[PDB]
Amino acid sequence: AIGVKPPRGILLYGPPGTGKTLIARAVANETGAFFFLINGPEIMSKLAGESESNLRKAFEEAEKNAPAIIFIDELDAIAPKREKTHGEVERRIVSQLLTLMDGLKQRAHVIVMAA
Amino acid sequence: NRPNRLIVDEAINEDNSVVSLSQPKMDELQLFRGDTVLLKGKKRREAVCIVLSDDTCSDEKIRMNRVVRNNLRVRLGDVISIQPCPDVKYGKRIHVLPIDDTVEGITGNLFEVYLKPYFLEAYRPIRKGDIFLVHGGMRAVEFKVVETDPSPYCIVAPDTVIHCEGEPIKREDEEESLNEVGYDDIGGCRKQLAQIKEMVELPLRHPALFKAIGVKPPRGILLYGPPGTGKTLIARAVANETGAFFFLINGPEIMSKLAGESESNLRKAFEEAEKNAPAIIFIDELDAIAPKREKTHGEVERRIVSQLLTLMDGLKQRAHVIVMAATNRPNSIDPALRRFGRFDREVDIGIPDATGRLEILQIHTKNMKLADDVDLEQVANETHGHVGADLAALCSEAALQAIRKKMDLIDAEVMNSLAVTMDDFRWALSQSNPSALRETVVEVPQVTWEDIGGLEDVKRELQELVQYPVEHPDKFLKFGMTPSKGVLFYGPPGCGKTLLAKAIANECQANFISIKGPELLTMWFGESEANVREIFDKARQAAPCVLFFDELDSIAKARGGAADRVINQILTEMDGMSTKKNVFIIGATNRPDIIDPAILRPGRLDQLIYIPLPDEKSRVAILKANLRKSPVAKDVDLEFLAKMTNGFSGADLTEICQRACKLAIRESIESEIRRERERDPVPEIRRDHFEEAMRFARRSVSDNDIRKYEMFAQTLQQSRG
Amino acid sequence: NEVGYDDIGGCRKQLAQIKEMVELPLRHPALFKAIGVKPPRGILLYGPPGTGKTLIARAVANETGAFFFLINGPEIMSKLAGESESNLRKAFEEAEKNAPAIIFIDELDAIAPKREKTHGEVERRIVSQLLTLMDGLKQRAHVIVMAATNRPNSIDPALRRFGRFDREVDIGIPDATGRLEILQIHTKNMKLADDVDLEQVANETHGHVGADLAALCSEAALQAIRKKMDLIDAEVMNSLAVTMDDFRWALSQSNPSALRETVVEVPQVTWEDIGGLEDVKRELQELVQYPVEHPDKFLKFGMTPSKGVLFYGPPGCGKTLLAKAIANECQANFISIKGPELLTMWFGESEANVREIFDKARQAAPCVLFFDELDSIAKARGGNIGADRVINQILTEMDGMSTKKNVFIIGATNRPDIIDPAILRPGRLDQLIYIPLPDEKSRVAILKANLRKSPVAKDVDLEFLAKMTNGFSGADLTEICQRACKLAIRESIESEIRRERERDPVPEIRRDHFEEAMRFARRSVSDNDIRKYEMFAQTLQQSRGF
Ligand SMILES: Nc1ncnc2c1ncn2[C@@H]1O[C@H](COP(=O)(O)OP(=O)(O)OP(O)(O)=S)[C@@H](O)[C@H]1O
Ligand SMILES: Nc1ncnc2c1ncn2[C@@H]1O[C@H](COP(=O)(O)OP(=O)(O)OP(O)(O)=S)[C@@H](O)[C@H]1O
Ligand SMILES: Nc1ncnc2c1ncn2[C@@H]1O[C@H](COP(=O)(O)OP(=O)(O)OP(O)(O)=S)[C@@H](O)[C@H]1O
Ligand SMILES: Nc1ncnc2c1ncn2[C@@H]1O[C@H](COP(=O)(O)OP(=O)(O)OP(O)(O)=S)[C@@H](O)[C@H]1O
Ligand SMILES: Nc1ncnc2c1ncn2[C@@H]1O[C@H](COP(=O)(O)OP(=O)(O)OP(O)(O)=S)[C@@H](O)[C@H]1O
């Protein structure tokens, strides 16, 4: 019906504390999709060299199941503007995220979501 | 020339690997009854078949069935080229593959059961990558030749042992290896695509043509502009058309690599680009790789862009390689890569216009079964500030809106009878938030020059100041004298000064860039006066063009008891423009009070034109062209209101038109309301609505202001000391 | 292949300076008895980008025959930590290992920017390594280094001391004759159609660097290829050509990259086109040209010079062209910055642009300055609070201009009341020249020098412009000439339209064209401002303190 890739990538912006985690949890536990979320500060907590570790593995685990949805939380901590990125590893992490996001196009119809 | 021109059409013969042609054109091409050809069509696809003679077939048309037409990825009506292939060798090993969604329900080998009776001494020449249909088991299953031992082309002999290794993959077998969309997938920038093709025509079909051009026109083209305009897709279409080994990399893809891994694949892409004598490469998202020194804060990215600056001119004159660039901002790239040695040429895609968006919608709604009810034209002209990827998103949202009025249990009939409506396009258009606005984009107006009351002396004066240097370049060298590039407008605040500027922009058929004074102070509010320089550079790149600086009273009212550095920047880069390039600048104000008389100097915008009140046929002329969701007023005395001078002072006679048609709106809605209450709405507008709008009317500009402008009829004598 | 001395044009003076600097690795190798200084190592080349900084160095290296070991900026900076010494020590080692030699570094801003602009420590390490190996290799085997950039003040100023990189030579933009020479040496490897002139294109191009003229030649040749039907043979190879319309097309779809640089050349305005200002011409001639071409007469008895003068009068008056006139008949290059252009760099607290302008004035001696339109600065300091801060930069920098070095300063204003009266009351800018409403024969002089698609108006009443006195308030009488142009264009399109609908263009402008042009003409300044301006005929009584 539509071959122009119905949209991969949804932002959940707005005020904090409005249950944006709860929306993704309800969607995950209702829609019947295998859910593989990862946390923002958890992967920021990793050291240099291990920062790509579990960042590649989350998208690999999304590729493991043919229906799959992930939901990254607190992307504001992950990806600020280039002026605020005075550290090299933050730019490397957001480059890895962008590379894994645009390298995977319409592969096993996965949906990514962010709050 | 090019005697292989053919048009695809419906076939008379149902043979899968045999097409039909015409006998005298076969003898023109020296063809035969059983020879083999190489049909090259769009998306650089190739098909090998055997041409049979057909008397009912046209001379300039070719007939091919659903096997050959889907082999070239073309629809009904495309253009192909035919080259006969007389050097065919015989096949030794043949490997074919099935499709996963067409093999369920039947089990067993397809070699002796399906491949054997289809190739039972059939003498069908096959091409690698082509799809052939085999009928069997009360079905029709498609199979694709993937590898042969004569790998380009062969003839299926009975002695040819055919492999039967079964690996069904997908229906999308050609979506990742090539993605072979060509110039049919790009519209709205035909001039820019033609310029890009003429730049890259030294890689393609002019290989050793450097004796005639020893300057080697530049290695490195920039494709800047707004985001989401198909800058990646332009490069993909060019690389598919040229056929050279393409080795594109992404900016974040190489920023994801570590230190030491950074030089890895950066040296390797440029080294692998050397191995082909035709070679074009491209690097994506240059702002990730090449920012300014102030933006970056790491030594690794600066070492990466230093290595890129080394490897740009480290290779020279070697296999005439061309690098290509893509970004979303022109000044964001480092100026070390804007030198004349490296990455010299800069072209901009921009956004398409209404004709361009119409072309994009027409080539985009092909792969979607509409209901054949929409017009595709109001949506085309409506979507100002909508970029092409946003147009694709609008198409997907309209498809989702058309799907969403159905059942979740899918249907027995929604897949083969899907449809979209015109109201679906309106609802997708209403609930759409594009990011392609806020840019001072280029457009050509459509403003039907008799729609004004006319001001025929002033319109002829604008004609003489603009278009006679434009349309007569011989009169720039034979007769006449020095020109006056620019004109200023002054008079009443509410008049058609913007209307005259866009009118002469349309009548000149030149580009119309109309920035705003509040928009200028908005860009200055971010502390950036180089934006005026970038506006003038966009003007020079948009040659020929017409420039408009409206609302100079907004600049004039910030005098003080902010600052007027923006008009000083404009005045500095007003006389710093060439008398060539056929650029032209229009200025306009509302009052002559604080007009900063340093800008009235000759050598700049000099002609001061005082616009008077227009004649009695101004609102007649907007009611002459009254399309405006409304019928034309009829059986009414129009000049009788001009006798009463219904706010007859400059503009805002369209205010009387708005008031009277809103009275007609009230009348029609009240008629509908008591028609609904009861259980011809008078769409035309009659005399009492115009008379009541005269009753509720006020003058727009006072007589004292008219007296002041009459006193300022000779205001070219400024700078009083 | 390799290139020599004949491929540089338009900067023969600077090229001769470079040849004189490399004359010591040449015909005078052991020139130490004549001078013991060893005149300085470290030739610094600066100016616009793409102007041939690699080409001049390579040509000088091939003429001298010395061993050339050049390195680039970002090529050296592309090495990692620990490999910055790699090839940077080794280039100087190879310069040590063979005596008659020259080395060169390109893009010095990539290697050595200012230390505040640096972020990483390896950039500081690299600039300290350069600062060690520059004067550390002193009087060893007589090697000369050369440095190229795109901007001089972006270089680290520690690299511009006496011992390091002192002889700053500017390549600059080429001249119009320099553009002609660049096109002449660029059409060697191209068989033209022998129909262009290469001169009207050259003077019609303005502010294009030699790389841009090379790109213009490429664009014209690509246009001539594009208009031809493509066929894969040599029948289009031997028939390569360029047309005059191809050069006009290449001049059209291009942009002057060297525009907005403050231009340094001599104009071509040729004194005879003045309207009849004789006393002002004689006084400006005596105050400008007389010290220049007669230095022996300017050293015996008479005039100890007092430079600096400003023009004033009506706002629409003819005061701009006289600076160009003394530039033509003084044999001095003309530098004319704009008063509106000063506030562009005043916005942002950039005081160094005026320093760069006066440094260019020092470098381009002899020269005549022209600060046009100080009334814009007066407007910025009068309409609001402030603007009037670069006018203090003007007064401070102009006292750095000594009485020698062959410089002059010309002011310009329209309303002399608010031009900050400390400008003119000391010996700085002491002289005042009134520029009145002009003499009667300006209309023929406009018609003489500006030929411009039409001859002199034949058998017309020339004296009627002195009789009816059209535009009789100051200058800008040339509005009547522009109106005659518009009426001539109207007659031409009338004849063209009539001969278009029917199936002698009349290129002569008659008396009735001027008579009709009379009606669309007014004065240029109100009479009360005229009475005030000849009330300010004696306006040197400024600093009106109570
Ligand atoms: N739309 C909602 N419907 C029902 N309960 C809600 C809703 N929004 C908020 N709540 C309640 O408020 C709580 C909000 O939980 P939080 O996790 O703190 O919200 P949050 O948005 O996930 O916080 P962050 O900062 O965005 S991770 C929920 O656990 C509910 O109890
Ligand atoms: N002119 C166009 N016609 C049709 N589809 C287009 C056009 N431009 C973009 N698209 C669609 O938009 C997507 C590609 O957009 P992009 O290549 O991302 O645009 P872009 O100009 O390259 O901006 P970037 O690269 O993301 S910064 C595909 O889905 C295309 O089908
Ligand atoms: N003589 C006229 N004939 C027809 N329509 C006119 C006429 N004068 C004004 N209008 C209409 O009124 C509008 C006024 O637009 P503008 O020219 O922008 O007004 P303005 O006098 O320039 O003042 P602003 O600040 O630009 S709104 C035009 O766009 C027309 O729609
Ligand atoms: N004086 C000149 N004579 C002949 N050709 C020239 C001249 N100046 C520039 N060119 C041409 O323009 C090109 C510029 O080459 P370069 O010398 O590398 O310029 P550049 O100044 O070193 O570049 P940057 O950006 O300033 S490092 C040359 O290769 C020639 O093709
Ligand atoms: N006596 C004259 N001789 C030659 N040209 C003159 C004469 N008087 C006026 N002109 C021309 O008239 C024009 C205006 O004179 P300018 O000195 O350039 O005016 P300006 O100093 O720029 O001040 P404004 O405010 O811009 S008119 C120039 O094109 C001059 O060449």
Residue numbers in the entry:
A (entry chain E): 232 to 346
B (entry chain D): 21 to 430, 438 to 588, 596 to 713, 726 to 767
C (entry chain C): 199 to 430, 438 to 591, 597 to 713, 726 to 768
How is this structure described in the published paper?
Human p97/VCP (valosin-containing protein) belongs to the type II AAA+ (ATPase Associated with various cellular Activities) protein family, which has two AAA+ ATPase domains. p97 comprises an N-terminal domain (NTD), two ATPase domains, D1 and D2, containing conserved Walker A and B motifs, and an unstructured C-terminal tail. Six p97 monomers form a functional complex, featuring a double-ring structure based on the association of D1 and D2. IBMPFD/ALS is a genetic disorder caused by a single amino acid mutation on the p97 ATPase, promoting ATPase activity and cofactor dysregulation.
To understand how the mutation alters the ATPase regulation, we assembled a full-length p97R155H with its p47 cofactor and first visualized their structures using single-particle cryo-EM. The N-domains of the p97R155H mutant all show up configurations in ADP- or ATPγS-bound states. The NTDs showed all up configurations when bound to ATPγS or in the absence of nucleotides. The presence of the nucleotides, such as ADP or ATPγS, destabilizes the dodecameric formation. When the nucleotide is present and binds to the enzyme mutant, the p97R155H dodecamer dissociates into two functional hexamers, allowing cofactor binding and performing ATP hydrolysis. Our structures also showed that the arginine fingers exhibit different conformations than those of the wild type when p97R155H binds to p47. Our functional and structural analyses showed that the p47 binding is likely to impact the p97R155H ATPase activities via changing the conformations of arginine fingers.
